[PDB]
Amino acid sequence: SHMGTEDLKYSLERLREILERLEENPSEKQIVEAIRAIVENNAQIVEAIRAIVENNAQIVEILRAIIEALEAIGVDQKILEEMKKLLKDLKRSLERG
Amino acid sequence: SHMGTEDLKYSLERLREILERLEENPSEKQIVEAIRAIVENNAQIVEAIRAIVENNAQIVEILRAIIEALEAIGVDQKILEEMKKLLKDLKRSL
Amino acid sequence: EDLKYSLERLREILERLEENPSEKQIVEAIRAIVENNAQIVEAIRAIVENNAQIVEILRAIIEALEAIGVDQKILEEMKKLLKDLKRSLERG
């Protein structure tokens, strides 16, 4: 279970610990242990990015609903147009799965 | 081509397989194998982040447009200064 | 921004390791990775803090729309979407 970016700081600090332990008394098993740790840190980095991406997708949904609110109340299409173009573009260049 | 975060998931599983093999039977060839796959998974991560940072600035520009519209149509100055301050306190952090 | 340098540095070190695997090279690569992962975590951290400020801006925006008199239907829609973002938001 990924809980937040503190998972990333804790797994990074553990990796820094292994690193100094490696450079002090190098050894193959220490090298494998560093790689093991790197994989744990990377697995948590990936989990964070997936969350952030879903987050931004959900932000786009809120932004679309907001544009609808402004339209449902009679705001000028002159104004809505610029917002609709920017959101269209963002929806195109959005990082997704 | 970076297609999305599914790339990160796919390069990560690959690195995990390499790691299991390395751990059941270590070897110098697999250690370099793993380090190569780490640089790969990391390159894609840097690609996703790059894309997220550009996405984020696009989101902020849309927020500014929304707030500028709100002012145009006569929202109250209390909430208006409240939103403009949030944007300024974001502009600092960036 | 400075994420680039940390990745390029790491890809050049990978070359030197590719040609003549040494304990020196391997350890250099790992340290270079740690630095790259350090930059990557820091970038993610900044992004996560900024999205929590984006959430607050969205809340205030929804309040300005309710204040002006947006229909309950679209309003509830917006309130539900932000509640869902708040619940799934990446944080510390």
Residue numbers in the entry:
A (entry chain B): 0 to 96
B (entry chain C): 0 to 93
C (entry chain A): 5 to 96
Quote from the publication.
The interaction energy between the flipping helix and the inner helices in the short state was tuned by combining hydrogen bond layers (“A”) or hydrophobic layers (“X”) in different orders in each of three possible positions. We also designed for structural ambiguity in the turn—with the result that the secondary structure prediction for residue 75 is mixed helical and coil, but with low confidence. Crystal structures were determined for all potential bistable candidates (XAX_GGDQ, XXA_GVDQ, XAA_GGHN, and XAA_GVDQ), and we chose to focus on XAA_GVDQ because of the presence of a bound calcium.
We used de novo protein design to generate very closely related proteins that adopt two very different states—a short state and a long state, like a viral fusion protein—and then created a single molecule that can be found in both forms. Inspired by class I viral fusion proteins, such as influenza hemagglutinin, we chose homotrimeric helical bundles as the fundamental architecture. We decided on a design scheme with two divergent conformations containing a constant six-helix bundle “base” and a variable portion with three inner helices and three “flipping” helices.
